[PDB]
Design a protein around this ligand. Structure first.
Ligand SMILES: Nc1nc2c(ncn2[C@@H]2O[C@H](COP(=O)(O)OP(=O)(O)OP(=O)(O)O)[C@@H](O)[C@H]2O)c(=O)[nH]1
Ligand SMILES: [Mg+2]
Lengths: 154, 90, 846
């Protein structure tokens, strides 16, 4: 972008400054008030989002809830009362929803659509006129791929 | 055209030229760039983690799934070039 | 006054404060972003009908700052006062403090644990135990509070990992076992075993409003089917216990090979089936599932998206959050019962005094004793409000009160003032309820006492209460090492900044502002984001001017390695009395035993000397003859008398010791190298020629003399410098770990531990780094690893800088990163140039 000459003081003495690692521009951008003189119209960015650990399913014949071995194995090894004080439930007591199965055919697809981009994570909405839907916006919005020429980066 | 003097990211840093892009558990893919070419240019590290941590029957499951995928590819290709095709099938 | 619509009357909350048994003072804490403020949002939605979450955004009802909204992280600990019902239906009054979970704001937790009795630790079920959780378990045990653990984000075990049920049970059991291990490492109490059978561990998911113990879900069974003792049924839903459908019993042996555990069979799999039928099968089999569970919805409610519909189904199913209330009542004491260890721990002068016995009963009338720790700003920033708890008596609006500071003693009576209480509030997050009286046991917001308060204060009565002493200051969990220098842009606007510099010193507990001898204004901090918030709040809220900030540097310290070659003797300028000293370094690990209060002064010589000759195998002669420790009574140095009563008359030596300890405690701060504190050194008194006349034994002769003696003994025994080292934990995917090893290779660091997280595809990297190299480290990782790896860093220890700080033969080229032998000389010369000393110091200077 186009832009929107300092004397030697007691304050900017380079004999007082320890030069160990070079300070860059992204240090000024991530922390706008620590390393910046005259920080006029900066905006405070988002800090951090927790790591979404969603793992994609490649085989439809596998069950929807499965120990996918990208997950690391858990290492294996309390006031438990005795069996003599016999607690007995009434006969009509059941666990909840025992007739329904644990997973169906639409379970893994329903979980995979929960982490879909807009509007594929939705199930209802309004229509949009066809010239207001960019199809290229993510592609130049993400980053530049490696090995591209100069003019494509520009 | 745009001039080469308008370019950015001309930075002589070992950390920023090799920015070390992600491959995302060997499951995520960069959109549009060819999927077979993306499987060729991968780090080929998570495949070792698979074949170490899959179950002994799951290697046969992976092989059977790849055979089903190659069967679908052979049903798909049955779009060749005319230099390797016959006359009755053209 | 105007107030939002609340499910209970405000006169009920006004009348409920007068009973000190029905109150709980609870601090919620945990690691960064493990679901604290969202659980507080769920509690506010439970207590308020007109406050609801947006469909696409988090509420953050207790995040009221603009920085807390723009950054997305918690900054300041915020209180709230609510009334909640338990399982059986009894109303309780909760004072809940939301503390920020970031490590650099750990000082915001220490100010929160001074005025509370119980700790609720939130732990992510996906990530498990992290750095700040491990630090807060230690900080909650060492402050002597009861600890309960709530496991948040169990839906990540459902919708993200897609984990089998008994493996998720194994994950939860591993998390609880790690909590029990971290408790048993620090606690001496063997009765602190955490288990869900005791009602001590609660399970929760904050995003979809899920909260249950064993007892609440057993109460759900008792409300669904009936005729079930739910308190007995909840005693057998954890551990290796099995439901046998033949005899209808709970047996520890396997009925079949495929028999699941009772926690999987009764609790966890119905949760999986509810989430599965809501998410995957909303169109086909959801009305049958909702008709079986007994939940009816509107047709307009059935057309929502997946996440608000799942939150609505879990809210209509589980209902009110009674298990959290049951846990915080069963395992956290009332302020009447739990007052005695609080007075024993925090009140100076002991519990055995007259005022300690009066505060030990939480008497709502009598001596008015209050302890204020937190200072809040207004919307205008021109005045502050004090915030604390009422230990004894009832505080009133318009009452004259006596404010006592941290420098107050009964001997001095200097740090005290008489002020007038303007208004009194009880604090909710986004509004304040004005009252005219607050009894004992509650929290209180006081207007009109903010002028003598610096960090903490004690509120007493003006007339009577003559033996009132102050409470202890806040002992923080870390030490701020980052130095930054500030100046105003226009030098004519210097008294404006000096206004704001003493205002941000009030709202920030661990902040340290000072003025150097060269005229530089130095602020101490613990990290980058901390001083970023310091600069934001400072400028935008207290300065409205432009402020120049210098390059950040870390705080250095001084030490020795060898024993001095020659005895160091010096006389007073009265030329009658001489002091001679040899300086030596301490043993390995004794410094930390002084810093962690294992060794203490004021012991009656027996157990003190016995520790030295038992563990570190010290001579009995040395072990009996220690006079003093460091710049503080808890500082890591020792002063040893090594005179003999046969060589010098110790009855005359015992009169000058009172001036030599002042000499030592004023000479161990601002040492001769670069005016900093010494670490790891013992000072040993050889020949002392003591004056006979009392006028020659004045302190003005001998205290700068003993200062020069310490300086000579320090300069002769090969002096070195020490720098702070940070502990770093890196959370990264399976391939970025090598990139982390690549990045840490250039900042003089080393990786100590690389451990896979059980139950998660992420790894943990535990390493050490120099704090002077840790500027921009997080940005380097989050740029080189595509933002996937995340890292937090805390202060850990001190180590010796390589190089000679006295080698004048080394020439230093400016504006260049120097290699390893040049480091100590560069650091020492540049700190002398910055602080304003001479360009060198000599061996024969003192
Ligand atoms: N999956 C899931 N995410 C959650 C849950 N609870 C909170 N989160 C999300 O995690 C992120 C952080 O939640 P916060 O409550 O802001 O985290 P925090 O603990 O307040 O962080 P601090 O500011 O350190 O207190 C937000 O996006 C929340 O929506 C939960 O039960 N499940
Ligand atoms: Mg928070």
């Amino acid at each position: 972008f186009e832009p929107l000459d300092e004397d030697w003081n007691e304050f900017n003495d380079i004999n007082k400054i320890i030069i160990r690692q070079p300070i860059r521009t992204e240090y000024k951008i991530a922390f706008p008030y620590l390393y910046n003189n005259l920080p006029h119209h900066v905006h405070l960015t988002w800090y951090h989002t927790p790591n979404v650990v969603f793992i994609k399913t490649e085989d439809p014949d596998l069950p929807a809830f499965y120990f996918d071995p990208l997950i690391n194995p858990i290492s294996h090894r309390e006031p438990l009362p005795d069996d003599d004080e016999e607690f007995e439930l009434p006969e009509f007591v059941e666990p909840f929803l025992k007739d329904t199965p644990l997973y169906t055919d639409n379970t893994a697809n329903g979980i995979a659509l929960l982490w879909a981009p807009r509007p594929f994570n939705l199930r209802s909405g309004r229509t949009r006129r066809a010239l207001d839907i960019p199809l290229v916006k993510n592609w130049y919005r993400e980053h530049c791929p490696a090995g591209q020429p100069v003019k494509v980066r520009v | 055209e745009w001039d080469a003097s308008e370019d950015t990211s001309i930075d002589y840093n070992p950390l920023y030229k090799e920015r070390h892009q992600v491959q995302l558990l060997g499951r995520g893919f960069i959109a549009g760039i060819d999927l077979k070419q993306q499987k060729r240019e991968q780090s080929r590290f998570y495949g070792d983690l698979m074949e170490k941590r899959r179950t002994l029957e799951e290697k046969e499951q992976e092989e059977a799934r790849l055979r089903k995928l190659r069967k679908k590819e052979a049903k798909q290709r049955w779009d060749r070039h005319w230099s390797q095709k016959k006359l009755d099938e053209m | 006054q105007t107030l939002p619509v609340t499910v209970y009357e405000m006169d009920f909350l006004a009348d409920l404060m007068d009973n000190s048994e029905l109150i709980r003072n609870v601090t919620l804490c945990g690691h960064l972003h493990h679901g604290k403020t969202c659980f507080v949002d769920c509690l506010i939605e439970q207590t308020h009908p007109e406050i609801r979450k947006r469909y696409d955004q988090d509420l953050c009802y207790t995040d009221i700052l603009f920085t807390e909204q723009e950054r997305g992280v918690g900054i300041k600990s915020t209180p709230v006062t609510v009334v909640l019902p338990d399982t059986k239906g009894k109303s309780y009054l909760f004072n809940i403090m939301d503390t920020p979970g970031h490590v650099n704001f750990s000082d915001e937790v220490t100010a929160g644990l001074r005025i509370s009795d119980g700790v609720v630790l939130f732990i992510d079920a996906a990530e498990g135990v992290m750095l700040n959780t491990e630090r807060l378990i230690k900080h909650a045990v060492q402050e002597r509070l009861a600890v309960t653990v709530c496991i948040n984000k169990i839906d990540r075990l459902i919708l993200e990992l897609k984990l089998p049920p008994t493996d998720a049970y194994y994950k939860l059991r591993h998390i609880v076992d790690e909590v029990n291990g971290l408790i048993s490492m620090y606690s001496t109490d063997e009765n602190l075993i955490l288990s869900p059978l005791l009602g001590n561990v609660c399970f929760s998911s904050s995003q979809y409003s899920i909260c249950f113990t064993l007892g609440s879900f057993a109460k759900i069974y008792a409300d669904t089917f009936g005729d079930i003792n739910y308190q007995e049924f909840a005693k057998r839903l954890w551990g290796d216990i099995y439901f046998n459908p033949k005899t209808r019993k709970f047996t520890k042996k396997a009925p079949t090979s495929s028999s699941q555990r009772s926690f999987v069979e009764f609790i966890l799999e119905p949760l999986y089936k509810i989430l599965a039928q809501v998410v995957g099968d909303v169109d086909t089999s959801l009305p049958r599932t909702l008709d079986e569970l007994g939940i009816h919805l509107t047709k307009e409610e059935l057309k929502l998206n997946i996440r608000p519909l799942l939150r609505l189904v879990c809210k209509k199913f589980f209902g009110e959050f009674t298990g959290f209330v049951d846990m915080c009542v069963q395992h956290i004491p009332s302020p009447k019962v739990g007052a005695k260890p609080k007075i024993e721990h925090t009140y100076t002068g002991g519990v055995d005094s007259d005022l300690g016995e009066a505060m030990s009963d939480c008497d709502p009338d009598g001596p008015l004793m209050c302890h204020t720790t937190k200072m809040y700003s207004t919307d205008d920033g021109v005045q502050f409000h004090a915030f604390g708890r009422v230990l004894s008596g009832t505080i009133h609006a318009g009452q004259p009160v006596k404010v006592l500071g941290e420098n107050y003693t009964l001997e001095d009576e200097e740090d005290s003032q008489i002020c007038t209480v303007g208004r009194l509030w009880i604090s909710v997050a986004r509004y304040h309820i004005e009252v005219n009286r607050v009894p004992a046991g509650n929290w209180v917001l006081i207007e009109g006492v903010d002028q003598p308060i610096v960090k903490t204060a004690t509120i007493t009565e003006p007339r009577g209460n003559e033996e009132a002493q102050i409470f202890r200051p806040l002992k923080f969990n870390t030490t701020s090492v980052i130095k930054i220098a500030v100046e105003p842009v226009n030098p004519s606007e210097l008294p404006k900044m000096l206004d704001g510099l003493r205002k941000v010193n009030k709202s920030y507990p661990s902040l340290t502002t000072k003025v150097e001898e060269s005229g530089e204004h130095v602020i101490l901090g613990t990290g980058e984001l901390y001083l970023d918030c310091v600069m934001h709040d400072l400028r935008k809220m207290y300065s409205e001017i432009d402020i120049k900030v210098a390059d950040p540097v870390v705080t250095f310290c001084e030490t020795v390695v060898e024993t001095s070659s020659l005895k160091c003797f010096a006389e007073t300028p009265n030329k009658k009395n001489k002091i001679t000293m040899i300086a030596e370094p301490l043993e390995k690990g004794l410094a930390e035993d002084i810093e962690n209060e294992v060794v203490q002064i004021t012991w009656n010589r027996k157990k003190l000397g016995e520790f030295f000759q038992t563990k570190y195998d010290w001579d009995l002669l040395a072990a009996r003859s220690i006079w003093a420790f460091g710049p503080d009574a808890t500082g890591p140095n020792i002063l040893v008398d090594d005179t003999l009563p046969s060589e010098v008359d110790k009855a005359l030596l015992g009169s000058v010791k009172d001036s030599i300890v002042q000499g030592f405690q004023w000479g161990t701060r601002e040492g001769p190298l670069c005016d900093e504190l010494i670490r790891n050194v013992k000072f040993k008194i050889l020949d002392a020629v003591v004056a006979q006349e009392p006028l020659h034994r004045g302190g003005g002769q001998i205290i700068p003399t003993a200062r020069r003696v310490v300086y000579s003994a320090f300069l002769m025994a090969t002096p070195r410098l020490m720098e702070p080292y940070y502990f770093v934990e890196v959370q990264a995917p399976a391939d970025c770990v090598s990139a982390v090893y690549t990045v840490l290779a250039r900042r003089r660091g080393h990786v100590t531990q690389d451990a896979p997280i059980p139950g998660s595809p992420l790894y943990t990297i535990k390493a050490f780094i120099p704090a002077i190299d840790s500027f921009g480290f997080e940005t380097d990782l989050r740029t080189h690893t595509q933002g996937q790896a995340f890292s937090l860093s805390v202060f850990h220890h001190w180590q010796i800088v390589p190089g000679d700080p006295l080698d004048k033969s080394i020439v230093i080229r400016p504006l260049e990163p120097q290699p390893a032998p040049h480091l100590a000389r560069e650091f020492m010369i540049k700190t002398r140039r910055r602080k304003g000393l001479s360009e060198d110091v000599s061996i024969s200077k003192f």
